[PDB]
Structures are given as structure tokens and as C-alpha cells.
Design a protein around this nucleic acid. Structure first.
Lengths: 168, 158, 57, 216, 295
RNA sequence: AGCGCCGUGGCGCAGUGGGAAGCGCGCAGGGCUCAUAACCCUGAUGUCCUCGGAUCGAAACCGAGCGGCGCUACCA
RNA sequence: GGUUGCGGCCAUAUCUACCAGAAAGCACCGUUUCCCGUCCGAUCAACUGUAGUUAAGCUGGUAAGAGCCUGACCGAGUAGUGUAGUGGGUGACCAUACGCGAAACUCAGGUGCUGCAAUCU
RNA sequence: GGCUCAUGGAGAACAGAAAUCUCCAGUAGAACAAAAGGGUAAAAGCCCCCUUGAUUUUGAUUUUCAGUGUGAAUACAAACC
RNA sequence: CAAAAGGUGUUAGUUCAUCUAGACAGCCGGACGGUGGCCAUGGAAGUCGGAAUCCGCUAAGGAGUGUGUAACAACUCACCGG
RNA sequence: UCCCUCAGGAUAGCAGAAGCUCGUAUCAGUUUUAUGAGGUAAAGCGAAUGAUUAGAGGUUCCGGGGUCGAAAUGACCUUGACCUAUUCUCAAACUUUAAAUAUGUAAGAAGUCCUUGUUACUUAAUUGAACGUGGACAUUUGAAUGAAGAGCUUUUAGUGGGCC
């Protein structure tokens, strides 16, 4: 029937993207370190654009991923800012979802005038238990059509838990 | 100018094979080569060390030396009006055994068995092989085989 | 002004007096054979020589 | 251009407009299908062929000139939608020309046969013996406007060609009565250009999505 | 209406890799460089100490390769340590060492090289390989096949390596990937290695997690409490296991409870067997007949 | 095709230690004159030809590619 | 017969969709003191075999399935080609004599087999 | 030693065709200094750790070939790494 | 040396159609009434065309094959017939 | 093959002569049987790369616009990007497949089988590997046909424009 198709948040990836490396990104790193409690990873630019105002190898963005009851708590914090109202967009065909928060002083963080203000990109990677099979080194394999967490199951779960609406 | 490089004119021969790309199957390495054993020469383009010249691709010689990852083969190279004794140094993926010599070396034992048997029995052995003999006198029977009278066809388009 | 190359008459020339096999001796060329196999093989054959020199009585 | 007898026979290997040619004068023939190229298969039962009974190269020029000539004659007699003519020979072979030039020029070109490798002159359709040139599909009522159209087209190409009223239906590979025997049951369907026949293989429900007059 | 990524052209041109690369069970890049031999040795069949960590078992085989398939010289499993009295922790560092000792001792018993190459009889937990004796035959050269397991320092796969070397086999190695190889200064300290040998790390977790979360000490170690086994005893349990393995590794199978015919009879019952040509003839005739008459 | 000089605002150009773009002409708008010109003031207009690299610093420095100009060669 | 570990040949084994799996085994799964590696015990590491599980993996079956592998007097003795002629034809090219002989297409079948060691109601 | 590349698909504030993030497909359609061809998918590719076999000794072998040279290459052996 | 393309020169051949009056010949009786058939227009009436298409006694004759007219009319072709 | 070589030379070949070692050998511009190699002719494109004609279907999410209630993330289109299943014709520098003719090797005394000897090589080993000792099997001596004698060496001429 449905014994172990528990459908638990795999990870929550909090992404901030600046077109500037130095003062403001050393601040944005301290912001994600403050929120999550993990020294984050400063993403490097893939190729120069010359229109947005970046070059390649220029250390443009910074992100972190959290796993488990922490990720659940930060998703609660971020959802209450989004009113527990997330469009039927924002929810990928592979049953993942995300949203963007402006002015990081929400979520019960202090302003921290020493650093300033920032926007974030929350992405919740949803998944059913026993998905190790795809990621483990030895004896790899793809999950069956049953175990594939689809859009409809992630939407209906996001309703049941968090007590939210899909707005569309 | 003209091109006479080592691997020149060898697009299609050192080509791997259709859906036989990737790795060499391990029997190739577990196979045992000894001196006096007749072996083919056929390069595996996927392996680019101890590979034979395109000349020797297709040739058959006899192993003369045996070392770590490689053998040594003697091949007959006609140049002008006379053969020479060409000694190759081939990694073991570029060679294989010749069923040519395997079918002889089992016929030797088949002859040894036939003769050693028929020495102490009623003897009509004829150990030598004979070619395809002119077929003997048979009666062909037309019992439910009354010959079908075929005729040649008229011409027609398509 | 000249011509460049032809392999015409070259077979005829070769076959007239030639195409010949290298005669194949018994006890072949033991040169370019594994040096440590040789180094040993000497001592083996010297051992067999002593063993038949002992057998001669 | 040079005369056609300069480049009549298949002397050189197929020299196609490749990534090695790179700079070819575009074919003089661009329209291969004329008449009612959108007609139902069941509309045009009679097919006639203009087949080369010789082996040679035909100029792109000759193809367009003969196409113009045949379609014109058939459109004028019968009407512009009483048939579908189809050219089945594409100019891909590239003819070269040495073009013996008067002066050396600034670049110091050359005299006679020093560097005689030619430059793309025009294209040719390398036809073979028993290879078809013009296929037409009309009513069984015509045939005569069609053969006479193809006869007027023969005067354009070199060598020898023949007119064959084929035993096939349209441009299908089936015969006249046995195509009708497939059209009896739901074994046939129509695209609009051509026909797809029911295969005795594949996913059964996927076959039954179409051909519901079969399995009836 | 975008990709149709799994085309007929794709499937026709698709070369499937070696069945054990599709199963994801064998590194052929390793297996080649591992099994292939110096051809001047002709037929000296290369033996490999193949070690495999499943859940609740440590498989450790001494395998040599033929053209027709790998064969086994001797084979040991951690599920047959309870004969020697390792009842709990079958898939830990201490079990690995014990199975490594057992497989080594089984081979040398079979091959008649048990009297010489007894191994280490006074375990300090030192890195050392079995030296070849003068005026005698040489020790068994076997090479550790690891598989798709990473070469980390303090892996159980090297617990088995240490076990086998102590068990009298010549399995050549360095001390780099042993638990207690201090990274800063190029030195092994035998304290943490000897701890890990005698389940020191499990026993030193026992007293810490007994004083701390007793709910977690009831979650884990529920078998250890049921056996009346305490944190102190484990060193002497493994010492009794070492000596009993060394005394009698006589390769004892089971009693085979409903024999190979009785198992086949029982197993064949539920397994679905292939349909015939007349079966499919009727099947397709029925699935055509479903759609034939307006359902 | 080769040889030499070039590529920056609409035009013609300077530019340098590598950190960071100006000069003249014009263009628009003022002032002066009764009015126009001359004249005196303000401004605005930039993929520093392109893709890579040396570099913390490039439009300059190296490489390759593209385009521009002039000359030489070339008489059916 | 089932399963595992290591395999041989490397699609009859792969792909796509579904539907089953008693036992054992495999797995998913549990924990983070230690060894160890991460931005994240997710992957990798150690601990337990305990807290749950066949939903996934894995194995098997199903489908006028894709693909692949077979076979045929299937097409075809066709295309092509070795040899021969003071054969034909303006030529392009072609027919015959003595030999060798495909590829497509069509139809029928098939859907891994096997080596070693251990385990299994 | 870890990983998988092109491209496509669905998605996350500013962010759009293009900055970063996540998953799904992906037999190579990428990449490997250049010409072109061959080769390569737990790698030969991309990222990371340590080094200097780009070393010493001279011989045999292959291609070009007179079986000369030169160049390049192969396989050992003896040392040291 | 000769090509494409042609010949009711003559020979053989391939496919389809006609014949107890064929039918070909090869001469001569009619080619019509309804009907001035619809629209286009001074005009189109058998013949500017988009197109329809029936009948009457019918031996047969297009609701029209060519000359003719502004438009008719007329002579004449199939079509059958002494 | 090399040369300031291209009207020339050295070089190897073809040629003659002098012979020599032995006496039908295990040789052959040959076939058969067995076993390789090949990517050319043909074929193929509803198989990859590249070329290429024709419609049908979906387009739906997306580049061109309203026809329209100003107005529709819209009813009707031409539409470009495409995807799907069909279609016509092609490739010296495409290819799954793949000839014919040419081409490698084997078809036995230097062979086979059974014991056993040294060795500083290799082996966990008393296992191998190379070479042997000692035995055993010669009518069919291990396909066909031929064999003009078979093998060996020295020396040196001319030639190195060729043409059909």
C-alpha cells in the first residue's frame, strides 16, 4: 500500500546572488552563516557576461543547503513570510519547489546594521525515503514510477503539512 | 607533400568496431602465450602501446619471446624478391591464438588414436585426407517426385 | 618532362631468379629474447651438460 | 555554359556540393513537385514513369527545361489540378570547368594544363539504366495528356528514355487491384500527401487508435 | 512533444556496458590492472583477498581467475564468527579483523603452510607484513580486492587486511590507511589500532552512552544487555575468538535442513514462468476481440 | 595577392607608470551685435575592432581573428 | 529452484510501461562517541542489527511494444565481380560462356546462458 | 582518488536570451594545446592530493629502408626513484 | 567514324478496338424541336467563358466541331443511315 | 634509395660467367582443407554524420498580428522555432551491413605420446618455463599436382629517356 512513502524534505538550498565580490558578499556569507549555522560556499562565475557587470572566476554568488529538522524550521520561518501562500508555479514537475524572500530582516533576524539587507532564494528538494539508491557509489539505479515524487504529491503534501494554500 | 606516417591510411582498420567500443574483455589477458605458439596480429586501437604497424595487421606469425605485458612475434616480410625475419614486440591485446594450428594439433592426436587403435584390430585406416571425390552411382526415386516441367518466363516491366 | 614511378616489370624481375624463403634453422635466433631468461637458460644448459658428464661412466 | 556533350557521361566520381566544394552556383531547378501535390492517393490511380534506358549525367538546366515543358503542356490541355508531376532526380553531382583564361592577371594564374583542376560550372543528375526521372499521377481517363507531356519532355534530355504506364497505384509500391483489396477493409489510412498501411506488429491498442474500420 | 529522448535510432546505436558495470558491482579498470599477470609466469594464478561489506556480514574470499570464471581457494563470512564466540557486532572493525584472521588460517590449513607462517602471536597492534622464512617455502602472495570502497584511514576493509596479515598471509600494504595513523607526523601509534582490533572503540562508546542517554543505550546494545555482556569483557571475548579461530578453522558448513531437491520443489511453486506462442495467440485474439464489438 | 601604416564620441586623432578616457572640428543651448559672421561660455554623444591570456591594475602588454587605408603587381 | 559474493561471454542480458515476490539473502532503513569526509553524516566514514520496511532497489513475469540476436528456396542466384571471345552496339553500355556471390526488404522464432564458493523453507 | 560532459526540460527575489541555485533526461551529440583521422564514460575527459620516468646504463626491435643514416616509436633487462 | 530527330520504303513483332454486312471504304440523307437554355451585354441566339447536359418521334444529330454575323440566319463536323 | 640530382652518377634489382655442398629435398608466380585479416564494388538513409523534395498532424509555451466586446496569458488564420509519424533523391574525403578477385598462416621426425635430469628464472609449493636423458609410434612419412636437380657463394657487364 503506502508503508515508507513518507515524502520528507531532503534538503533546503538558500541561494543569494550578487554581481559583486568583496565587501557585500563577505557580508552575505555572514548572513547565511547566521541563519543556517554553517560556513557557506561562495559560488564562482562560469563565463563573463559584460552586461550585468560580472566577469568569470569572480566569486559572484554564495549559497548553503540545510538537511533535517533545521531545514523544516527555516522552511516554516520562510513560509510564514510568504503568508503560507505559494503559486502553482514555483513547484517543479519533479515535485521540488522554492520561493524568494526580499529584505532578510524578516524570519526573526535582527537588522544587523554592520552588514545590511539581502534577498534569498529558498529551494525545498522534496523526496521519499530510500532515494539513496540513485546517490550511493555501488549498485546504482533509478527509483520506480511509484517512488518518483511528482508535482501533484509535493503540492498535496505542502497543503497537508504547514497548513498552506497554493493560491492558483 | 605526400604523407607516409606510422598510422597513415589507417582510419578504418584501427577503428574499434560497431557497438564493440570501450573496454577489453578480461579473457584476452588471462590467455597464456608460450614460445613456438602461432598467433595472429590485429591491433586494438583503444590500446595505443606496443601496437603493430598496419602492414602486420592481418598477418600470422609465431611467438619467439615472452615478457610482462607483451610477446615477441616472427613474421615473413617480402621486400623486392626475398623474405626477411621481422621481429615485432606486441602488447597482448593486439594478438590472439590461431584455430588454424588448434585444428591441426587435435588432428595429430586423432591420427595417433586411429593408428594406435587399428594396429591391433582389423585395419583399413587411410590416415591421409582426400579431396571432394566425384560422387558415386545413386538411384534417384520418383515416388511422389514426378518431375515438375519448368518453362522459361515471358518478359514484363516490374 | 620525365615520369615519376611505376611498379611495372618489378614482379617479373623479382620472380625471375628470386622470391625465396629464409630457410628456417633449428635452434633459432636467441637474441632480443628476455635477457634474464637467457642469463638463467645458460646455467640450465651448463647444468644438463654436467649431469650427462656425470652420467658418462 | 559549355555544351551538354562536354559532360554527358559519368566519367568522374560523384562530386557532391560538400563542405569541400563550399562555393557552387545554385541549381537551376528548385521546384520538383507540380500540379495537385496535395491530392488524396485515391484521387490519382494511374501513374506513368519517364525512365532513362541509358546511363549518363543530366544538367540541372535540362531537368528544369523538361519540367517546364511537360507541366505547361499538361496544365494547358487538361488543367493545373488534373495531375501531380514529381521530378525524382536531384542535381547533386558538380561539373567542373578549367575555363582557359586570356591574360595571366595580377595573381599570375597559369597557362594550359599546369594546375588544371576545374571550378564548379553547374550541377548534374547522375541517372542510371532503368532509373526513373518523371513520375506523374492522374485519373485513368487521361494517360494521353500525360504520355504526350512526357514525350515533349524527352526532347530536352540527351540519350534514350521510355514511357511506362506502371501497374502500381499512385506513387505507392502496391499494384492496382491489391491496393484496392487493402482499401476494402480499414488496412489503409491517408496523411494527405501519401498513405500509411496497418503493420501486423507494434503495440495493439496503439494500432487500434487508428484503423477502427479494421478490428470491425 | 519536445525530446522523444529514447528514440529507436538511440536504442539501435546504444552499446550496453559489461553486465557487472550495468549491475554496478565491478570496477573493470581496477580488475584488469589487478588480475592480469606477468606473462613470463604463464600459469601462476593471481589470488586476491576479496573483501565485501554488506549489511550484517563481512564476506572475505581468496579468489583466483580462470578464462571461464573466478574460482575460490578459501572463503570466510562474519556470520560464522559466533561458533568462536563473537555473537554481537558481526559487521564492525573487530569482526573484520577476526574474518581476516579466519580466512588466512583456513587457506594455510588447506595449503599445508600453517606450521610455518603462524603470523603474530603477541598482538601489539603494529603495522607488519609476514616475512619470508630462510631455508623454507615463501608466504602466500594475495592482493586485497576492495571493489567500489574508498581508501579512507580507519576503514573495516583494512581491518580485514590487518586480520589476514596477522593470520599469516603476505598481503603487502603500508600503514597509511589504518585507524590511528597520525596525519601530522609520519607515524602509526599502535594504541588506537589495538583498541579497534579488540573492539576498544565500541567498548569506549558503551560506558560513555551508558552514563549518558540510557534510552539510546536501550535502542542500541539490546543484544549486549540480553547476553549479560558488559563494556569491559569485549577485549577478552575477541582474544578467545582469535585463539579458537587459530586452533580450529576447519571450514564447517550447515546441516542443510530440507536438501537441495526439497528447496527447489518449494521455491519453484510461486515463481511466474513464461507464456508460450499459442498463449500469446489467444491473448492478442482476446485483446483484439475486446475492441472488435464496440466493447 | 603581397608590403607598410592603422582600428577610441558623428568626423580627424592624442593618449600612458596598467591602477581611472581626453584634444581639435563639428552638434545642441546661451552670451555679445540693431542683426549676421568673427568672437566668449556651457553642456551631450564612448561594445577604446574582436576573442583569449599575462595581471591585484589594460583601451594600451602578448597571441590569434576581423575590418580599414595606401602602395606594388596586373593591358584584353 | 531462490539469494548473495566473485565472475565468463558482454543487449537473447539494454530500453519503455505495468504487475508479482514465501523463505533466506540483498537492500532501504536507525544513530553520530570514535576513525574519517563534507557548505550539509546527503555521498564517503564509524556504531547498531537494535526502532520500521517490501514502497523503491533487486529478481521474475506481462506487451500483435522499441531495440537486439537467430533462421529461411524471403528477396536473389538479383546487384556486383574473376575469367573469355575478330560477341553486340556510333557510342553510352549491354547479352552470352565458365566460376564466385552480397545488402536492403519479407516472413518465422527468440528475449540471457554459464563458472566457482557460501546460504536458504 | 572523486565526479560526469554537450544539449534539452521543469523550476527559485532583484534576474531578463543570457549572473547563481535545484532536480529530471542525457552512448558522448562534449572535452582531450593545434590540422585531420582514430581512441576514450566509475576514463584518456573535469576537480582535488603527492611528485619529477621529461632520470642513469647501454644493447635489441618496428616505420621510412639500401633493410644505411636521421627523426619518431616499441618491448625488455640492469640501477635509482 | 557518325548523332539526335524523322519516313504509309519494306520485313517481322507488341497492345487495344470494329466485323452476317463489317468498318475501313468512298460516294450521297439529315446534323433537329422544345430553345430567344442561366448569367455576364447595345449586343453572345450552337461556337467570350463559370459551368450545367434533359428529353420528344427518335435511324441519328453537342442545349453544339469549324466558316459567318454588331447580334441572327445560313453552309457544315461528329452522329448515325439507302 | 640518395646526390646543386632531373642529358649524369653511386645503390639495389634484372644479366653472364666461375664454380661449390650435396643428391630428389620439402621447394613451388598452383589448387584443396582449415583458420585469419580487409572496409573496395554493391547496398543503406521510415540506421548515425552531411546533403535534400513534399505534404499531413501536434503545435500552445513559444518568435511574427489583429481580424475583434479599448480589452482577453483569447473563437478564426498566415505563421517562424520546433516535435511526431510518413515521403522523393544523394555522398572521393558518410555508414549499420558487406563481396568477387588479390592476401597471411598451418597441413607433422626440428612430429606426437609416456616417464624422468639441471636452473643463479619464475612459483605458496615438489607449480612452471626453456632445453634435454631414457623409452614408444615409420606400409597410411599424416591433402592435390609438379619438380626440369636442390641449396650456397664470389665476381662483374649493360641499364637506370621507355612505350603500347
Amino acid at each position: 500500500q503506502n508503508p515508507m512513502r513518507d515524502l520528507k524534505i531532503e534538503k533546503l538550498v538558500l541561494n543569494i546572488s550578487v554581481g559583486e565580490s568583496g565587501d557585500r558578499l563577505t557580508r552575505a556569507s555572514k548572513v547565511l552563516e547566521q541563519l543556517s549555522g554553517q560556513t557557506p560556499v561562495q559560488s564562482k562565475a562560469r563565463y563573463t557576461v559584460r552586461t550585468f557587470g560580472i566577469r568569470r572566476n569572480e566569486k559572484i554568488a554564495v549559497h548553503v543547503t540545510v538537511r533535517g529538522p533545521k531545514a523544516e524550521e527555516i522552511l516554516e520561518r520562510g513560509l510564514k513570510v510568504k503568508e503560507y501562500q505559494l503559486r502553482d508555479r514555483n513547484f517543479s514537475a519533479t515535485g521540488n519547489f522554492g520561493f524568494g524572500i526580499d529584505e532578510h530582516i524578516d524570519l526573526g533576524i535582527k537588522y544587523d546594521p554592520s552588514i545590511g539587507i539581502f534577498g534569498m532564494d529558498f529551494y525545498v528538494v522534496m523526496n521519499r525515503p530510500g532515494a539513496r539508491v540513485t546517490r550511493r557509489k555501488r549498485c546504482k539505479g533509478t527509483v520506480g514510477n511509484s517512488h518518483k515524487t511528482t508535482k501533484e504529491d509535493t503540492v498535496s503534501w505542502f497543503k497537508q503539512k504547514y497548513d498552506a494554500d497554493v493560491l492558483d | 607533400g605526400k604523407s607516409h606516417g606510422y598510422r597513415s591510411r589507417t582510419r578504418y582498420m584501427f577503428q574499434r568496431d560497431f557497438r564493440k567500443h570501450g573496454a577489453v574483455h578480461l579473457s584476452t589477458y588471462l590467455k597464456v602465450y608460450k614460445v613456438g605458439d602461432i598467433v595472429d596480429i590485429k591491433a586494438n586501437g583503444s590500446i595505443q602501446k606496443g601496437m603493430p604497424h598496419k602492414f602486420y595487421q592481418g598477418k600470422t606469425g609465431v611467438v619467439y619471446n615472452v615478457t610482462k605485458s607483451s610477446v615477441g612475434v616472427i613474421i615473413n616480410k617480402m621486400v623486392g624478391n626475398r623474405y626477411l625475419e621481422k621481429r615485432l614486440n606486441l602488447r597482448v591485446e593486439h594478438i590472439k591464438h590461431s584455430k588454424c594450428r588448434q585444428e591441426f594439433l587435435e588432428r595429430v592426436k586423432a591420427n595417433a588414436a586411429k593408428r594406435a587403435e587399428a594396429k591391433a584390430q582389423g585395419v583399413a585406416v587411410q590416415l591421409k585426407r582426400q579431396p571432394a571425390q566425384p560422387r558415386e552411382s545413386r538411384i534417384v526415386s520418383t515416388e511422389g517426385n514426378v518431375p515438375q516441367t519448368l518453362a522459361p518466363v515471358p518478359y514484363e516491366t516490374f | 618532362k620525365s615520369k615519376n614511378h611505376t611498379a611495372h616489370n618489378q614482379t617479373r624481375k623479382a620472380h625471375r631468379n628470386g622470391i625465396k624463403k629464409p630457410k628456417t634453422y633449428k635452434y633459432p635466433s636467441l637474441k632480443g629474447v628476455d635477457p634474464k631468461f637467457r642469463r638463467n637458460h645458460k646455467h640450465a644448459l651448463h647444468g644438463t651438460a654436467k649431469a650427462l658428464a656425470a652420467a658418462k661412466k | 555554359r559549355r555544351p551538354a556533350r562536354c559532360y554527358r557521361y559519368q566519367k568522374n566520381k560523384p562530386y557532391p556540393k560538400s563542405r569541400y566544394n563550399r562555393a557552387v552556383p545554385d541549381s537551376k531547378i528548385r521546384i520538383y513537385d507540380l500540379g495537385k501535390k496535395k491530392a488524396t492517393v485515391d484521387e490519382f490511380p494511374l501513374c506513368v514513369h519517364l525512365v532513362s534506358n541509358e546511363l549518363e549525367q543530366l544538367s540541372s538546366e535540362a531537368l528544369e527545361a523538361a519540367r517546364i515543358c511537360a507541366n505547361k503542356y499538361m496544365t494547358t490541355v487538361s488543367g493545373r489540378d488534373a495531375f501531380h508531376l514529381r521530378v525524382r532526380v536531384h542535381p547533386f553531382h558538380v561539373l567542373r570547368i578549367n575555363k582557359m583564361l586570356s591574360c595571366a592577371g595580377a595573381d599570375r594564374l597559369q597557362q594550359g594544363m599546369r594546375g588544371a583542376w576545374g571550378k564548379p560550372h553547374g550541377l548534374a543528375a547522375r541517372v542510371d539504366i532503368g532509373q526513373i526521372i518523371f513520375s506523374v499521377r492522374t485519373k485513368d481517363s487521361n494517360k494521353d495528356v500525360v504520355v504526350e507531356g512526357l514525350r515533349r519532355a524527352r526532347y530536352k534530355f540527351p540519350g534514350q528514355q521510355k514511357i511506362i504506364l506502371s501497374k502500381k497505384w499512385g506513387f505507392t509500391n502496391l499494384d492496382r487491384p491489391e491496393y484496392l483489396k487493402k482499401r476494402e477493409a480499414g488496412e489503409v489510412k491517408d496523411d494527405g500527401a501519401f498513405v500509411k498501411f496497418l503493420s501486423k506488429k507494434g503495440s495493439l491498442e496503439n494500432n487500434i487508435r487508428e484503423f477502427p474500420e479494421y478490428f470491425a | 512533444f519536445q525530446k522523444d529522448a529514447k528514440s529507436s535510432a538511440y536504442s539501435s546505436r546504444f552499446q550496453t556496458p559489461f553486465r557487472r558495470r550495468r549491475e554496478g558491482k565491478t570496477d573493470y579498470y581496477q580488475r584488469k590492472r589487478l588480475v592480469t599477470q606477468h606473462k613470463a609466469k604463464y600459469n601462476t594464478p593471481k589470488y586476491r583477498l576479496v573483501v565485501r561489506f554488506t549489511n550484517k556480514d563481512i564476506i572475505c574470499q581468496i579468489i583466483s581467475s580462470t578464462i571461464t570464471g573466478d574460482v575460490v581457494l578459501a572463503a570466510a563470512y562474519s556470520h560464522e564468527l559466533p561458533r568462536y564466540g563473537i555473537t554481537h557486532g558481526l559487521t564492525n572493525w573487530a569482526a573484520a579483523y577476526a574474518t581476516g584472521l579466519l580466512i588466512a588460517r583456513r587457506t594455510l590449513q588447506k595449503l599445508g603452510l600453517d606450521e610455518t607462517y603462524k603470523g603474530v602471536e603477541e598482538v601489539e597492534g603494529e603495522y607488519e607484513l609476514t616475512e619470508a622464512v630462510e631455508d623454507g617455502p615463501r608466504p602466500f602472495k594475495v592482493f586485497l580486492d576492495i571493489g567500489l570502497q574508498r581508501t579512507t584511514t580507519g576503514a573495516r576493509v583494512f581491518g580485514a587486511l590487518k586480520g589476514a596479515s596477522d593470520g599469516g598471509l603476505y598481503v603487502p600494504h603500508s600503514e597509511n590507511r589504518f585507524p590511528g595513523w597520525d596525519f601530522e607526523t609520519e607515524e602509526i601509534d599502535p594504541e588506537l589500532l589495538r583498541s579497534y582490533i579488540f573492539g576498544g572503540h565500541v567498548s569506549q562508546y558503551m560506558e560513555e552512552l551508558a552514563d549518558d542517554d540510557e534510552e539510546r543505550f536501550s535502542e542500541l546494545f539490546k543484544g549486549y544487555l540480553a547476553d549479560d555482556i558488559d563494556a569491559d569483557s569485549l577485549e577478552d571475548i575477541y582474544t578467545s575468538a582469535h585463539e579458537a579461530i587459530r586452533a580450529d578453522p576447519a571450514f564447517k558448513p550447515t546441516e542443510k535442513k530440507f536438501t537441495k531437491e526439497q528447496y527447489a520443489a518449494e521455491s519453484k511453486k510461486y515463481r511466474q514462468t513464461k507464456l508460450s506462442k499459442e498463449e500469446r495467440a489467444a491473448r492478442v485474439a482476446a485483446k483484439i476481440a475486446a475492441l472488435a464489438g464496440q466493447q
